[PDB]
Amino acid sequence: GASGSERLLDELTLEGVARYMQSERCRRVICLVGAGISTSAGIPDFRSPSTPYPEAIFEISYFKKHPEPFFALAKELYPGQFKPTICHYFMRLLKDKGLLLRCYTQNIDTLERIAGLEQEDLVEAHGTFYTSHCVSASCRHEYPLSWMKEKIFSEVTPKCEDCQSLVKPDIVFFGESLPARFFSCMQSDFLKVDLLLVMGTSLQVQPFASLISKAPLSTPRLLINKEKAGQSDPFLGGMDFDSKKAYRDVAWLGECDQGCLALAELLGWKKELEDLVRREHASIDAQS
Numbered sequence: 171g172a173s174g175s176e177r178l179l180d181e182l183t184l185e186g187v188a189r190y191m192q193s194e195r196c197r198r199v200i201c202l203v204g205a206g207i208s209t210s211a212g213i214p215d216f217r218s219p220s221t222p223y224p225e226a227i228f229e230i231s232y233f234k235k236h237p238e239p240f241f242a243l244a245k246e247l248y249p250g251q252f253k254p255t256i257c258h259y260f261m262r263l264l265k266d267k268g269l270l271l272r273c274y275t276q277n278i279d280t281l282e283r284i285a286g287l288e289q290e291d292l293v294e295a296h297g298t299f300y301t302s303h304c305v306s307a308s309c310r311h312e313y314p315l316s317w318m319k320e321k322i323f324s325e326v327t328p329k330c331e332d333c334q335s336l337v338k339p340d341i342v343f344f345g346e347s348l349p350a351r352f353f354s355c356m357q358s359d360f361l362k363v364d365l366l367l368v369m370g371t372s373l374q375v376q377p378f379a380s381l382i383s384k385a386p387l388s389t390p391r392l393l394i395n396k397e398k399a400g401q402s403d404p405f406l407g408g409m410d411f412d413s414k415k416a417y418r419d420v421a422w423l424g425e426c427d428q429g430c431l432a433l434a435e436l437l438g439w440k441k442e443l444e445d446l447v448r449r450e451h452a453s454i455d456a457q458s
């Protein structure tokens with residue numbers, strides 16, 4: 171139930187969340203993540219202002235007629251390295267610890283995959299650069315990012331080797347529906363969740379943001395983010411961190427990496443997280 175029933179967290183703190191996680195009551199964790207978890211990897215949040223019309227470059231209709239702008243922008247914005255953050259590897263540890271039900275991400279940078287989350291673990295709600303497809307319905311040939319990368323840097327508009335149609339990265343352009351997988355997984359996963367871990371998202375983009383309202387009423391929800399988010403808009407279920415009726419929502423405010431480190435430390439996972447990150451970062455740095 172809500173604030174009227176006995177709550178699962180013994181206190182509304184990171185410390186309370188850690189005790190809950192290591193209790194028998196917490197078995198399945200859903201992570202909801204956004205651009206905030208990749209900024210420390212040197213991937214800007216293109217929605218953060220600090221990072222025909224400008225909106226045309228993401229519209230599917232305009233893209234299919236005039237793809238050159240998008241791919242030009244793709245070359246400029248292409249990350250120089252793909253080194254996932256502490257936050258990403260924290261989710262890998264959740265997976266290793268047998269706690270990860272699913273990671274729903276708004277990001278298209280593939281860092282979840284690089285950090286060791288598998289396709290089954292992931293719902294890429296806004297799509298991904300990881301794969302691309304020929305746009306012709308009768309073909310739909312799939313191309314890997316290695317192939318798409320070469321096209322982007324060579325400044326060759328990617329065309330299908332089978333039919334010479336345009337090849338589009340599997341990101342959701344404006345005008346496109348979210349993937350069916352998003353809705354199918356949402357329907358099953360939120361029946362099963364013991365803990366929501368919301369990291370690096372302001373929960374302002376729909377329908378992704380509405381996911382927090384899909385949790386059972388008893389399910390604790392931990393926000394790790396630079397700013398509080400998810401609270402109902404006074405003008406326009408929602409997060410309640412601070413009222414007298416607060417019973418399950420906890421906000422840890424700071425960088426996602428530092429919050430995840432703090433949580434790992436409480437869990438006795440800090441050494442494991444340190445070792446995993448330094449090993450994987452070393453491996454990525456040593457790619458030849």
Ligand SMILES: Cc1cc(C)nc(SCC(=O)Nc2cccc(COc3cccc(NC(=O)c4cnn(C)c4)c3)c2)n1
Nearest residue numbers: 216228244247248249278279296299341342343344376377
């Ligand atoms: C080029 C590249 C390659 C790889 C592997 N990673 C990157 S990450 C860096 C970067 O910013 N890459 C990059 C390059 C171009 C555009 C965008 C982001 O802007 C877009 C583009 C297309 C669609 C959308 N749409 C949505 O997000 C959406 C749609 N519906 N809803 C509800 C939301 C946004 C990001 N970049």
Ligand SMILES: [Zn+2]
Nearest residue numbers: 304309330333
């Ligand atoms: Zn084709």
